Write a protein that binds this ligand. Structure first.
Ligand SMILES: CCc1oc2ccccc2c1C(=O)c1cc(Br)c(O)c(Br)c1
Length: 472
């Protein structure tokens, strides 16, 4: 009978707008802490330390000291034992440390801990560990927000994000940085599920479109907050602090938001629920029907399609979270991409949805997965002679893969007996954050050709979208 009390107490109005505003803002920084592994773990050009150069014809010394490399560059992993002055066979690996290029980044984690050359597989694992953390944090938090409430967990998760982000920026060794990022990811997943649920519960029956639109449209401007804070702070020890600092201020003000009124009824905390409903009504200024609440009323109140959705969610999660955490290979000028993956997400999603829904729901579902797969697949074909075309396709693709996140939820998830969609939307997400941990692991296949990662990242969504045409 809870919708009746909600209608008696409000619906739209004022409070349901300030709550949405105060809950949407953390989503931007939540995005910031997930795509931050693109400007923090950046790999600049690295060469081998030499006694002749870099103190104890500059080009002549560079040519005589380092053997030439395959890709029209000096070798990044080998050096001459002695100066081969015959150049107007016998080589050893770098043992005096590397020298890096300090022209766009001052200090990345790679520069600090030498994650190059033989120790290359370490870099694509710090993101898999992060996503695994997200999964294990979104699994536990489910059976946590039922014995602790729903508002307290959000505040403690804000505090945990703040503390873990601050601590992870002052570690002296790699494994501690891997572990504290794991904790950060778990807390971030908890924040994102609790915020979604809190936005869900307090709203009326019209929670379907508006709130789920606001959550996504929040992630988009998010990308543009990374782009920006980056252009500003370049180092890596001063970036994690500058990103995790706002969460403490968020926790400080999160102590006043009223707790969800539906959970309080089912556990027997009637008096606090009455107080929360009364304060919500007072905020909403609809203090006319609040008199009727005299406790007694609240006392009385107290298979093929599923598989197709699973594959669609899995394909969406795998390609995006494995080709968007490597934008240094999709082009150049990183502080422009990871900053245009957003202004090309909102017009594109709106226009594509509006145009393709009238054709049909299944046509819209199919057209949103084959298109970006083909777009990404075409990227390897075009040579590097024209940069603008080399970089244009990826933005539109990764942009349209974002369109699945919305299209496959507010237009999909009805492919079932149609009782309530909330028992299917959650089931889809387990595969997304359970295939992104199987994401950047594909980038570990840089050896044995460099085109295979892009080929896989393009073919998998293509096959998923094409098989989606086999619904009957
Ligand atoms: C543009 C689409 C999009 O952009 C992001 C940027 C940062 C974090 C999540 C997302 C995101 C998601 O839809 C999403 C949400 C959750 Br929850 C996940 O576990 C995974 Br994987 C992906």
């Amino acid at each position: 009978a809870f919708p009746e009390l909600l209608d008696r107490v409000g619906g739209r109005g004022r409070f349901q707008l300030l709550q949405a505003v105060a809950l949407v803002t953390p989503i931007l920084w939540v995005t910031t802490q997930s795509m931050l592994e693109n400007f923090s773990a950046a790999v600049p050009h690295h060469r081998c330390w030499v006694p002749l150069l870099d103190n104890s014809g500059r080009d002549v010394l560079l040519a005589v000291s380092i053997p030439p490399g395959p890709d029209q560059r000096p070798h990044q992993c080998l050096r001459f034992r002695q100066p081969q002055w015959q150049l107007i066979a016998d080589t050893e690996p770098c043992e005096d440390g590397w020298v890096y290029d300090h022209s766009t980044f001052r200090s990345t984690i790679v520069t600090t801990w030498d994650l190059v050359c033989d120790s290359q597989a370490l870099r694509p694992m710090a993101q898999s560990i992060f996503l695994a953390g997200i999964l294990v944090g979104a699994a536990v938090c489910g059976h946590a927000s039922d014995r602790f409430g729903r508002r307290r967990v959000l505040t403690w998760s804000y505090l945990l994000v703040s503390v873990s982000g601050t601590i992870a920026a002052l570690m002296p060794t790699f494994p501690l940085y891997c572990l504290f990022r794991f904790l950060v990811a778990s807390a971030v997943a908890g924040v994102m599920m609790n915020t979604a649920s809190l936005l869900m519960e307090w709203t009326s029956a019209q929670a379907g479109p508006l709130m789920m639109t606001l959550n996504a449209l929040g992630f988009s401007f998010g990308q543009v907050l990374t782009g920006s804070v980056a252009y500003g702070v370049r180092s890596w020890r001063m970036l994690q602090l500058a990103v995790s600092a706002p969460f403490f201020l968020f926790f400080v003000y999160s102590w006043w938001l009223p707790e969800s009124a539906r959970w309080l009824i089912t556990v027997g905390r009637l008096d606090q629920s009455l107080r929360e409903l009364q304060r919500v009504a007072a905020v909403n200024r609809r203090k006319a029907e609040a008199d009727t609440l005299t406790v007694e009323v609240l006392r009385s109140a107290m298979r093929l399609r599923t598989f197709i959705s699973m594959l669609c969610w899995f394909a969406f999660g795998f390609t995006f979270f494995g080709l968007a955490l490597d934008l240094q290979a999709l082009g150049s000028n990183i502080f422009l991409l990871q900053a245009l993956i957003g202004i090309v997400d909102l017009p594109v999603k709106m226009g594509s949805l509006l145009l393709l829904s009238r054709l049909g729901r299944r046509l819209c579902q199919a057209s949103s997965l084959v298109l970006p797969g083909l777009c990404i697949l075409a990227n390897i074909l075009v040579p590097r002679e024209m940069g603008i075309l080399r970089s244009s396709l990826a933005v539109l693709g990764l942009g349209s893969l974002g369109a699945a996140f919305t299209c496959v939820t507010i237009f999909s998830s009805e492919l079932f007996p149609t009782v309530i969609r909330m028992t299917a939307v959650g089931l889809g997400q387990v595969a997304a954050r359970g295939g992104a941990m199987l994401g950047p692991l594909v980038r570990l296949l840089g050896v044995y050709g460099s085109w295979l990662p892009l080929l896989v990242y393009g073919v998998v969504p293509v096959l998923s979208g094409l098989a989606a045409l086999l619904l009957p």
